[PDB]
């Protein structure tokens, strides 16, 4: 059962099969990276949720705060990066994840690491080093070398993690089979789907309007989830209706005023996705319980911050 | 005047007048980096006399091993590379250099220096490292991701020195002009020209016949240059006449039987030259001088070596 468990909400396991034979193991281990970024998202969320589902399966959990693969990636200084990192590690504190965490610089410029990036630098192709930052590398009119030593990076960092389970977003799938290809022990790898940005223009990101953040107030949620994208019995790329799959608890039930139908008690996302598409449920009635509900969802990781926050 | 003695025989300066402004201070350094070689040829021994020139010029030189490019360089294992560094050394030293010596991994591992690597990778084009390496890069079907991290260490280690001149053939001209464009400090770059093989086929190398070793036994010089690349009355691209030109000392006479000149006196290599273009000096004379005067040259070199090799 613990197979289904984890792969639940998932894209794709490369493989089901080398999973199965990990799942067989007394101690098993998975890691995630994640360059630090100043907001912490739905997206970030749906992935600890992932690595949630790992530990109860028995995994031991390692976060990687990747600030040296966000140096190569031109997110400013290093200082600032691990600044961001800290706060990073205290939110996914927040989340309910107990786990290890490390950052790539702690490991990541000692002799022995450097020497197998360089070793991996020999071994990989500059084609596939490219190809395999193209939904990843900060866009640019004049691609530097940083672009390609940090995928061999990446892969440097799963070698010295030795994780049975490397787990990211569906964006991270190039790398990871570059890793594959490249490391004595093949990870097996679990990758989430991407969320859709608020905006309805792609992945979800720290753009002004695009995200939830886990710790955004109460009023921030309500307004950015009500001037989403979400036209009206469109499921597809609507991120109202993904937040609907991937957040919320059901059954729920959905308030609306008489005119409109009363409370509409909904079973599953199954049924919610139903009312949608046949224009049973209107976009303002869907956002109107997206809103409450995340706001009761991230309460707790809004909370449990809040009172660090004070350092008391 | 020491202007005038480092300028001999060189192919360029980047450039003059910053050379006359390094000649003004009171300590001055250059260098010049070597992938360990197998064999000490020629090739080498014209550069390092130009370093003898330095040195003789109140330079203190610094000669890098440098076993960590050759190893990006695709030129075998790093502990075995180190080992022809050791030999390297010993050619060097038997050569009447006075320096000091560095492998490239004593220093081009530590935390510092990777973190300027992965600094210089965020500034450096892909295409302005890949152009750099065209005369450099062992070639390759498959270009790997080593290729565009060579140059930005080999720039690099001109910032660990510090040099205020760093030497090498023209075929590090790119690379120099990138540690112009990506250091606080420019160095003065000083270019040796390429000397080509004895082979008449590109430049000198350790491929079979086509290098003449500073350590080659006397009858080893005499077969290389008698079946070496050398048409009559042809001077450019002619490895016996380069050989002329930058090894041997002036005046010398050349022997000859008395059916074709007798002995000829020779003041200078552009009296030289003038008797070979005119077909006054035949090849076969010309070879059977050249390898005779060479293994005088070399003699010092190998019998020094030579009396280290019995370890007594």
Same mark, same amino acid.
């Given at each position: 059962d613990e197979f289904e468990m984890i792969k639940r909400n998932t894209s794709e396991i490369i493989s089901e099969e080398e999973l199965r034979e990990v799942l067989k193991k007394d101690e098993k281990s998975a890691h995630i990276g994640f360059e630090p970024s100043g907001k912490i998202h739905l997206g970030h969320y749906l992935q600890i949720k992932k690595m949630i589902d790992l530990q109860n399966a028995g995994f031991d959990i390692i976060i990687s705060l990747a600030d040296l693969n966000a140096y190569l990636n031109q997110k400013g200084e290093l200082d600032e990066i691990r600044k961001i990192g800290d706060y990073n590690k205290k939110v996914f504190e927040a989340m309910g994840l107990k786990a290890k965490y490390v950052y790539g610089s702690e490991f990541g410029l000692d002799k022995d690491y450097t020497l197998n990036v360089y070793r991996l630098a020999l071994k990989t192709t500059l084609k596939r080093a490219r190809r395999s930052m193209e939904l990843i590398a900060r866009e640019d009119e004049n691609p530097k070398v940083a672009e390609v030593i940090y995928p061999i990076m990446q892969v440097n960092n799963s070698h010295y993690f030795g994780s049975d389970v490397a787990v990211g977003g569906m964006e991270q799938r190039k790398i990871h089979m570059l890793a594959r290809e490249l490391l004595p022990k093949k990870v097996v790898?679990?990758?989430?789907?991407?969320?859709?940005?608020?905006?309805?223009?792609?992945?979800?990101?720290?753009?002004?309007?695009?995200?939830?953040?886990?710790?955004?107030?109460?009023?921030?949620?309500?307004?950015?989830?009500? #001037?989403?994208?979400?036209?009206?019995?469109?499921?597809?790329? /609507?991120?109202?209706? &993904?937040?609907?799959?991937?957040? !919320? @608890?059901?059954?729920?039930?959905?308030?609306?005023?008489?005119?409109?139908?009363?409370?509409?008690?909904?079973?599953?996302?199954?049924?919610?996705?139903?009312?949608? #598409?046949?224009?049973?449920?209107?976009?303002?009635?869907?956002? /109107?319980?997206?809103? &409450?509900?995340?706001?009761?969802? !991230? @309460?707790?990781?809004?909370?449990?911050?809040?009172?660090?926050?004070?350092?008391?």
């Open positions: 790898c679990i990758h989430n789907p991407v969320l859709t940005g608020l905006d309805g223009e792609g992945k979800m990101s720290s753009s002004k309007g695009n995200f939830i953040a886990v710790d955004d107030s109460p009023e921030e949620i309500r307004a950015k989830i009500k #001037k989403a994208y979400c036209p009206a019995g469109v499921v597809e790329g /609507n991120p109202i209706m &993904e937040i609907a799959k991937y957040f !919320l @608890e059901y059954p729920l039930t959905i308030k609306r005023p008489e005119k409109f139908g009363g409370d509409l008690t909904v079973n599953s996302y199954e049924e919610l996705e139903s009312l949608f #598409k046949n224009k049973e449920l209107h976009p303002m009635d869907l956002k /109107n319980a997206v809103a &409450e509900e995340l706001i009761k969802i !991230l @309460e707790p990781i809004r909370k449990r911050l809040l009172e660090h926050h004070h350092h008391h």
